Amino acid sequence: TASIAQARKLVEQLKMEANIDRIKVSKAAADLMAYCEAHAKEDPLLTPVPASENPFR
Amino acid sequence: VSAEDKAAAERSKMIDKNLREDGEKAAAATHRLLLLGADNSGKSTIVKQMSGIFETKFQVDKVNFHMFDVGAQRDERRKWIQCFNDVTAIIFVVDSSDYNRLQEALNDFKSIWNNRWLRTISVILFLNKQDLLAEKVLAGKSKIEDYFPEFARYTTPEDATPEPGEDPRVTRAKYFIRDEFLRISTASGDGRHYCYPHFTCSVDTENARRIFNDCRDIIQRMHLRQYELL
Amino acid sequence: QVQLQESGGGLVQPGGSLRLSCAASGFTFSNYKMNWVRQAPGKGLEWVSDISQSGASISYTGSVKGRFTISRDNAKNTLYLQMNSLKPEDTAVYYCARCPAPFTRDCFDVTSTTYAYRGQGTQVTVS
Amino acid sequence: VRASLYSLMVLIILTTLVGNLIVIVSISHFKQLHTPTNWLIHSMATVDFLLGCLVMPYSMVRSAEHCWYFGEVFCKIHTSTDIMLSSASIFHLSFISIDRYYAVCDPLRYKAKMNILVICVMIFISWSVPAVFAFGMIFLELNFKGAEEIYYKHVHCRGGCSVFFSKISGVLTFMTSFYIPGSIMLCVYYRIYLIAKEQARLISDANQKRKAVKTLGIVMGVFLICWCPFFICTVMDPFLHYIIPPTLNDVLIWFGYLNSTFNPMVYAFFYPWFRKALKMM
Amino acid sequence: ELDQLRQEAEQLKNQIRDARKACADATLSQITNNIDPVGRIQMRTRRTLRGHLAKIYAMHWGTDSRLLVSASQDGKLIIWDSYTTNKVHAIPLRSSWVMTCAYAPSGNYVACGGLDNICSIYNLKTREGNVRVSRELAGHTGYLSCCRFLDDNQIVTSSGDTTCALWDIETGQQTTTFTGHTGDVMSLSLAPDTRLFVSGACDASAKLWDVREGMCRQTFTGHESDINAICFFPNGNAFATGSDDATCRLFDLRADQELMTYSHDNIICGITSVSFSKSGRLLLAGYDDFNCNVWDALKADRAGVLAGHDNRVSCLGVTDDGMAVATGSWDSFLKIWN
Ligand SMILES: CCN(CC)C(=O)[C@@H]1C=C2c3cccc4[nH]cc(c34)C[C@H]2N(C)C1
């Protein structure tokens, strides 16, 4: 009763993964793009900071 | 500056000097080894030496050796074997009598030899259970030719060094196993590491001396390669 | 998503000929060194054969030297094991397992008990 | 022709300065290049750099003109510093040879035997001993004791300020600055060659079942070609009643300088790790 | 029988794939095709922390963005101050085979684990002023690969026991155990809200776990090789993964499938560390080919190289304020880039 136990656990996990509200990939990409655009100015790496404000002289 | 800054600088200097002193103290004349093998192999009894990893500290001539027998881990080893790419050698142990698992010993040694991070690491091959292998060959109940068809076309090497009171069949079998391992080691060997074969019984006590001599050869060849003499 | 489902096998008379085929999905089949492994009833997994990514290299277990032939189809993403002149000891579950990393000549965990990249196993029986 | 010889000597001293400065700055700048052997090589390059910035640029002026323009006490200082720095360079060569011998014939106790304390002792002895012997044999006239009489004819015939070795100082200098350092550098660069040949034979024979020659040949041949002619002529100079021409002596001392030119290119530039460090620089 | 269960699982996987394909409207690469690229990104080594005598296996930035914890195979856990290159601490590790280290969000604790299968937690703020081990978190069967701090009392450890675990530091027991990975869990990253965390394993699949529930929320399968590093997006709605096949892949939690694959023909060497920037626009990946490549997480195109490490880069972290990217390689040097 080991292989059947593993199989039933796997199918239960698959059901728990399937019964979710999967959003559109376009919507998720739009959200990621919006966040990147919104916080693009708080990024010292993306936008280099002057050495005066750069703690790592 | 400030008092806090000066205290921080003094603390940093003290920590740096302590680390440097401890490193040169614990790294001088101390070589680390990876004791690897199978459960049937006598890796736990290789060196006579008078909870997640074992440890074995021994010395031969004012040189301390450390062997890390990683035993309390899962059978999958492709991940924690990369932590041992700095050892001076790998103490590979093979049970020569068990021809059934000899093939998996062979391909495990092949994977160790051909590993990207273990390419520089040189293997000190230890073919254990020589008494068992000799008894098997002498009895003849177990046949090595069925498990290795190429044994029939095999003749003992001319420069072989058998014990005087030994059987030619046993010598041929053990040198066939040795050649198998050496062929695996030399086919894809890049020249930066070498396989040092040995014949170990359950009662041998000079295994520490053998490890010492081979590690001496390993470090000597490393120095010669470093200085462009090899 | 990485399913190495294999086909073929079944029941054949001793000395017969079965041809196992393997279907590889979700990865570049030309980058991984493919392996064949059998699990005898009540025994650990035993590595059978090994073919390099380009197919130039090749190796077999001594017990099946000359009786098994391994072949890979990089374009078709299929791996084959030409089992002919079988013997009673060949009865085992055959898994199509690939080596964990691409562009590597080493294969560490192919014969592991619970290796991640292997097929379910096509039963092969001879009697 | 004199001007052409000068351009050549200027090239020699410039090569000395560039190579040894590169070696010292690389060793002192890369913390990976801080092994005791690397420190010994750094001290060697410092010795050669001082040689080329203290005694070579004025030996160049002496040569091709045969008239020392800079005085007498400064000439004594020049000779003293030449002997010190050349003996220091040869001592450094011998100590690097001993370091290699230990690293090859005792690979396990290498970081233990050849530690930074022993390397500093070697640097100190190769600096202090040469210096004290040199400024001594020069400023207490230990070399003129044998035959100040021959020296009288010699100083006049020298009509200038070339070194003098009566009978024993030449033999002592030869057996202190060249032979003893040279014999040690040959008794360890040949024993090593036997071992490096055996390893290259066992490795080659095992695969079937030469680079040591080249490297030890260049290492033990640059030194020999650059120094041994000068030293044999100098030790034979007390005999033969001083038959050597001054221009031949100038050529031989310049070969001795070429040893210090080629020391960096033999001991640092020749090995891949230092070339990689230079590329990282 | 087991064939009915296998068939039911296969149908479940097939319908999950169909739902994912239906939700797959357009790729992020298509979405970002309009925007201009980040451009060439040049990062210079502002500080080079030296003092480790052996390979550095892991590091972790502090919440204050100043103090980072470094770990090496020598047996020392050195805590640095990147502003002044001052070794604020140096803990003598009992086991030299440490694979991971972490720094507490409050700054009071530091953890480490490795081949000893034990997560050793070190109390930085002690009354006597000396660092002492607070707990020996034992209970894992395999080596620990990445442990992260939730609070001063909760820690999540990814082990090669194919199971992630949640511990109680005060009790030192298994508060919640996460199971389901077929392969050795090699790295986990915590979400900004700390309610969820994803983990990468040696089964080429990354899964999302609920800390409170203790159950695998969903599984992501898009890697063709072993996964080694994983890190959430600053949203907490996505993450990136590294793998031996030299491919970085960004998955979306709600979309339940990948978005883009950060791969190139030239790169053939596996990935050892992955970290996002403060805004998530830059995906920094530490390959084991002795350098790192900064990836434009939107355009999916390489936009920079962090070269200067002699040996394989093993760890890579970005400060919480995103003012630095400290890389730690096997050449015993830990470099801060900015
Ligand atoms: C033309 C006259 N000059 C210059 C004043 C010399 O002969 C110098 C004297 C030397 C000399 C004497 C005695 C022992 C020694 N060891 C190393 C040297 C050495 C160097 C050697 N230099 C090169 C030339």
Side-chain angles (χ1 to χ4, degrees), chain A residues 2-57, chain B residues 1-47 49 51-230, chain C, chain D residues 1 3-4 6-30 32-68 71-73 75-136 138-144 146-147 150-151 155 157 159-166 168-174 176-240 242-275 277-278, chain E residues 1-27 29-338:
Chain A
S3 66
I4 182 166
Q6 274 178 17
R8 59 175 74 179
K9 183 52 68 189
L10 285 181
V11 304
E12 287 297 326
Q13 186 56 72
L14 285 156
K15 284 191 200 138
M16 267 293 118
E17 179 183 331
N19 50 29
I20 63 170
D21 47 353
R22 271 178 278 271
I23 62 170
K24 314 302 140 193
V25 165
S26 279
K27 196 163 42 195
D31 303 343
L32 261 63
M33 181 95 188
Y35 182 87
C36 285
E37 293 288 27
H39 292 171
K41 61 183 180 308
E42 303 104 293
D43 213 327
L45 317 166
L46 159 70
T47 306
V49 72
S52 56
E53 296 297 328
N54 182 301
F56 308 76
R57 174 186 177 181
Chain B
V1 298
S2 179
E4 277 61 31
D5 291 331
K6 278 307 198 61
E10 286 178 6
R11 181 80 171 288
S12 158
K13 294 296 174 170
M14 171 285 258
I15 298 287
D16 188 86
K17 77 173 179 65
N18 206 326
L19 291 164
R20 186 272 304 278
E21 286 168 339
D22 196 300
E24 266 162 333
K25 159 252 186 185
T30 294
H31 294 291
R32 278 172 303 116
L33 305 172
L34 171 61
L35 173 46
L36 188 153
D39 65 357
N40 61 340
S41 67
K43 64 174 176 177
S44 60
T45 61
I46 288 299
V47 288
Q49 205 189 181
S51 313
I53 182 170
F54 293 99
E55 189 82 11
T56 307
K57 299 161 220 81
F58 69 97
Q59 68 163 31
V60 166
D61 280 0
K62 290 292 191 292
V63 185
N64 313 298
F65 294 111
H66 298 342
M67 297 189 321
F68 310 106
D69 178 22
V70 186
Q73 290 272 352
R74 284 170 74 266
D75 63 358
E76 299 202 39
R77 80 184 77 234
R78 73 177 170 272
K79 283 304 170 183
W80 59 261
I81 208 71
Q82 328 181 350
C83 289
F84 296 98
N85 78 322
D86 63 358
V87 288
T88 65
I90 286 175
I91 311 302
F92 207 92
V93 189
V94 181
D95 176 357
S96 286
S97 68
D98 293 355
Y99 319 102
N100 309 349
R101 300 178 67 186
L102 178 52
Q103 179 53 245
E104 72 182 3
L106 294 174
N107 64 9
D108 184 12
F109 170 67
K110 185 183 287 185
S111 313
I112 291 289
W113 199 259
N114 288 304
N115 194 5
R116 184 181 181 130
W117 312 116
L118 278 66
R119 262 202 263 280
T120 300
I121 304 300
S122 65
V123 180
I124 301 179
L125 177 85
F126 273 103
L127 305 163
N128 195 275
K129 300 308 188 31
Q130 293 294 250
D131 303 348
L132 278 77
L133 169 61
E135 277 194 358
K136 279 220 175 180
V137 177
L138 190 148
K141 321 302 167 190
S142 293
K143 324 292 301 283
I144 190 167
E145 86 283 334
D146 312 308
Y147 294 160
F148 289 94
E150 293 83 3
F151 182 62
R153 318 279 86 180
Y154 180 83
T155 57
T156 177
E158 291 219 290
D159 56 355
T161 300
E163 198 273 329
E166 201 172 5
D167 195 286
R169 261 170 312 136
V170 175
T171 295
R172 180 164 172 257
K174 70 183 182 75
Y175 273 100
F176 165 64
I177 315 300
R178 209 184 50 94
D179 276 7
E180 201 86 30
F181 282 93
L182 274 295
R183 184 170 61 240
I184 294 169
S185 68
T186 54
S188 305
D190 43 358
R192 311 246 305 275
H193 67 309
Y194 314 100
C195 176
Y196 299 83
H198 283 294
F199 292 139
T200 305
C201 311
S202 297
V203 303
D204 291 331
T205 60
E206 51 271 21
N207 285 116
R209 168 64 53 181
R210 280 162 177 156
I211 290 180
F212 181 91
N213 285 336
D214 296 354
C215 293
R216 201 205 60 234
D217 262 8
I218 288 150
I219 306 300
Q220 175 175 97
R221 275 142 170 202
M222 193 251 288
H223 286 155
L224 292 167
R225 198 167 310 110
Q226 188 187 104
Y227 301 143
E228 291 266 319
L229 282 72
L230 183 63
Chain C
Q1 207 264 339
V2 176
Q3 309 191 6
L4 282 75
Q5 181 85 89
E6 66 268 18
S7 55
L11 163 77
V12 65
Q13 306 305 302
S17 301
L18 278 176
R19 175 195 182 87
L20 322 173
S21 185
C22 175
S25 302
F27 58 97
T28 61
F29 186 79
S30 74
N31 283 162
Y32 303 85
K33 185 176 180 180
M34 291 295 327
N35 291 52
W36 272 101
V37 292
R38 44 191 211 161
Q39 173 160 70
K43 277 189 62 180
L45 286 89
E46 173 168 36
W47 168 84
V48 188
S49 179
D50 219 322
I51 181 164
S52 189
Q53 46 181 353
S54 60
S57 178
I58 198 165
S59 73
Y60 304 71
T61 310
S63 300
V64 296
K65 202 62 149 283
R67 314 198 289 114
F68 290 5
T69 299
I70 179 154
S71 64
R72 61 158 65 231
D73 200 314
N74 283 351
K76 190 63 179 175
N77 295 18
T78 44
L79 176 79
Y80 319 102
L81 178 73
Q82 181 62 259
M83 293 177 70
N84 44 7
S85 177
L86 278 75
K87 285 183 63 183
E89 76 264 9
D90 287 334
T91 294
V93 190
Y94 282 73
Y95 314 92
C96 177
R98 72 158 168 92
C99 301
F103 292 164
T104 61
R105 254 190 321 271
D106 56 346
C107 301
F108 269 95
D109 297 335
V110 176
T111 187
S112 302
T113 304
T114 187
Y115 188 42
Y117 322 123
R118 60 172 43 156
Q120 269 64 24
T122 61
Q123 177 63 57
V124 163
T125 54
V126 288
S127 52
Chain D
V1 284
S4 70
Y6 268 2
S7 296
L8 205 62
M9 281 155 218
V10 165
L11 291 163
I12 302 295
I13 48 184
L14 279 167
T15 311
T16 306
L17 294 184
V18 175
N20 292 290
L21 194 149
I22 287 176
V23 173
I24 56 178
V25 298
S26 307
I27 300 284
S28 179
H29 185 267
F30 283 52
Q32 53 154 330
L33 264 56
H34 272 66
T35 57
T37 307
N38 282 116
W39 276 129
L40 203 47
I41 291 177
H42 169 87
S43 177
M44 180 205 63
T46 298
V47 170
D48 294 338
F49 186 84
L50 297 190
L51 191 79
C53 79
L54 292 178
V55 310
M56 280 196 247
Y58 311 133
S59 295
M60 182 179 72
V61 176
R62 178 209 314 119
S63 312
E65 297 194 350
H66 303 286
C67 192
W68 181 238
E72 191 193 6
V73 60
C75 180
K76 287 134 173 194
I77 295 171
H78 181 95
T79 300
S80 315
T81 43
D82 201 358
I83 289 161
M84 169 183 171
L85 293 168
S86 300
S87 294
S89 175
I90 305 185
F91 274 41
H92 272 104
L93 296 190
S94 315
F95 287 140
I96 294 157
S97 84
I98 285 190
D99 180 277
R100 300 264 157 78
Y101 173 80
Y102 274 121
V104 161
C105 298
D106 201 328
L108 296 186
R109 283 79 62 93
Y110 172 51
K111 298 178 218 145
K113 280 188 183 294
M114 301 285 318
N115 48 2
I116 193 66
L117 168 72
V118 162
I119 285 301
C120 294
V121 167
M122 276 166 169
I123 291 173
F124 164 72
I125 184 168
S126 66
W127 277 67
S128 59
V129 168
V132 301
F133 143 66
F135 297 64
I138 308 314
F139 284 110
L140 301 148
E141 311 300 329
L142 275 296
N143 49 358
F144 293 175
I150 297 301
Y151 175 56
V155 65
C157 88
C161 203
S162 177
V163 69
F164 181 38
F165 303 111
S166 174
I168 313 295
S169 61
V171 178
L172 294 174
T173 54
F174 177 83
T176 286
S177 194
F178 175 78
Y179 186 80
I180 282 186
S183 59
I184 294 188
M185 195 181 160
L186 183 63
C187 277
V188 306
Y189 273 140
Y190 172 74
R191 178 164 181 179
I192 277 173
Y193 160 74
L194 303 186
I195 293 171
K197 169 181 70 175
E198 207 187 342
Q199 292 331 285
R201 167 189 73 95
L202 296 180
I203 291 159
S204 181
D205 287 332
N207 216 306
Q208 305 306 113
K209 184 202 201 223
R210 53 191 210 220
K211 198 155 61 167
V213 176
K214 177 176 72 66
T215 180
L216 294 194
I218 190 167
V219 163
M220 198 56 204
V222 161
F223 160 85
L224 277 190
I225 297 169
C226 288
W227 270 127
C228 67
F230 164 76
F231 269 106
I232 55 149
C233 292
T234 300
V235 71
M236 294 182 286
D237 210 4
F239 312 144
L240 283 72
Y242 308 85
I243 209 171
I244 209 168
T247 175
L248 193 71
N249 195 6
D250 302 350
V251 179
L252 302 191
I253 73 169
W254 268 108
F255 275 34
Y257 295 158
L258 267 70
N259 188 6
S260 302
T261 62
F262 300 154
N263 272 343
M265 294 182 286
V266 159
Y267 286 86
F269 292 167
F270 174 46
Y271 300 127
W273 35 268
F274 189 88
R275 257 177 290 130
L278 189 143
Chain E
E1 57 89 20
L2 172 60
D3 49 342
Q4 177 259 328
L5 280 75
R6 200 263 187 261
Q7 187 56 225
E8 207 269 333
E10 188 263 356
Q11 313 303 20
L12 283 174
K13 299 156 203 170
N14 274 11
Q15 59 95 24
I16 286 171
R17 187 270 305 276
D18 303 343
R20 279 163 180 190
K21 180 67 174 66
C23 297
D25 186 17
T27 61
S29 183
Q30 287 177 17
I31 304 294
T32 60
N33 215 9
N34 54 1
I35 193 183
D36 55 356
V38 173
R40 264 160 201 201
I41 288 308
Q42 272 98 40
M43 302 194 153
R44 294 163 85 257
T45 308
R46 309 309 193 185
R47 321 273 176 175
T48 307
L49 318 183
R50 311 139 180 284
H52 276 291
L53 308 155
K55 310 192 284 274
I56 297 169
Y57 284 153
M59 61 95 58
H60 195 245
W61 271 107
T63 300
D64 60 349
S65 306
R66 195 182 160 131
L67 294 174
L68 62 100
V69 37
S70 183
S72 178
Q73 65 182 357
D74 48 49
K76 295 290 172 172
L77 188 146
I78 301 173
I79 305 189
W80 311 76
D81 190 297
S82 46
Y83 291 1
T84 61
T85 315
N86 279 342
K87 312 188 177 77
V88 188
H89 271 101
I91 297 89
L93 301 173
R94 187 221 84 193
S95 168
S96 87
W97 305 117
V98 298
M99 311 185 38
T100 174
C101 59
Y103 197 98
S106 71
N108 301 342
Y109 293 63
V110 166
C112 74
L115 304 194
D116 63 358
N117 313 325
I118 301 160
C119 201
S120 81
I121 310 188
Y122 294 145
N123 200 331
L124 289 192
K125 309 291 108 175
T126 61
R127 330 180 186 275
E128 76 254 31
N130 201 6
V131 63
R132 301 293 165 91
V133 56
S134 170
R135 206 52 65 76
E136 294 293 328
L137 290 193
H140 278 294
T141 300
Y143 66 95
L144 282 72
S145 47
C146 184
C147 51
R148 287 292 169 266
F149 266 103
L150 280 160
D151 302 307
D152 268 8
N153 196 37
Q154 303 204 110
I155 185 182
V156 183
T157 61
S158 43
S159 193
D161 179 20
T162 62
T163 48
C164 292
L166 168 64
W167 306 76
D168 193 301
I169 294 177
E170 194 175 6
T171 306
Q173 67 182 357
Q174 288 288 284
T175 298
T176 316
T177 304
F178 307 93
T179 199
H181 266 309
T182 318
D184 292 359
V185 194
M186 291 285 327
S187 179
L188 53 80
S189 73
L190 266 55
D193 60 351
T194 61
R195 311 260 301 140
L196 309 167
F197 76 99
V198 298
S199 68
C202 280
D203 57 46
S205 73
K207 299 175 181 283
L208 171 65
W209 314 83
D210 204 314
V211 174
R212 298 317 193 73
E213 279 156 25
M215 69 162 280
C216 176
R217 262 260 301 275
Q218 43 177 314
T219 307
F220 304 80
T221 61
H223 272 243
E224 333 172 0
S225 192
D226 284 58
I227 302 187
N228 294 350
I230 190 157
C231 187
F232 269 80
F233 206 75
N235 290 318
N237 277 327
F239 59 92
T241 45
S243 174
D244 300 59
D245 51 34
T247 61
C248 274
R249 264 181 220 91
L250 199 151
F251 304 84
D252 198 275
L253 302 174
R254 294 179 293 173
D256 203 8
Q257 59 183 351
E258 65 183 1
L259 289 192
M260 294 182 286
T261 294
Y262 306 91
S263 183
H264 199 257
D265 200 14
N266 284 317
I267 54 174
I268 56 173
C269 295
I271 297 169
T272 69
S273 284
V274 163
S275 293
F276 272 111
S277 180
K278 180 142 210 303
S279 74
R281 178 57 168 284
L282 286 190
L283 174 58
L284 292 86
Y287 304 84
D288 53 28
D289 63 358
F290 303 169
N291 63 2
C292 308
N293 284 2
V294 179
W295 286 87
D296 190 354
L298 286 186
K299 305 294 283 292
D301 294 347
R302 183 165 68 258
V305 167
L306 314 190
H309 277 293
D310 296 290
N311 207 335
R312 154 192 178 162
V313 169
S314 62
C315 51
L316 193 145
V318 187
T319 68
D320 291 331
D321 54 10
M323 280 269 176
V325 178
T327 64
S329 51
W330 281 8
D331 57 42
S332 306
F333 303 133
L334 192 143
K335 293 188 161 43
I336 296 90
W337 310 68
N338 192 356

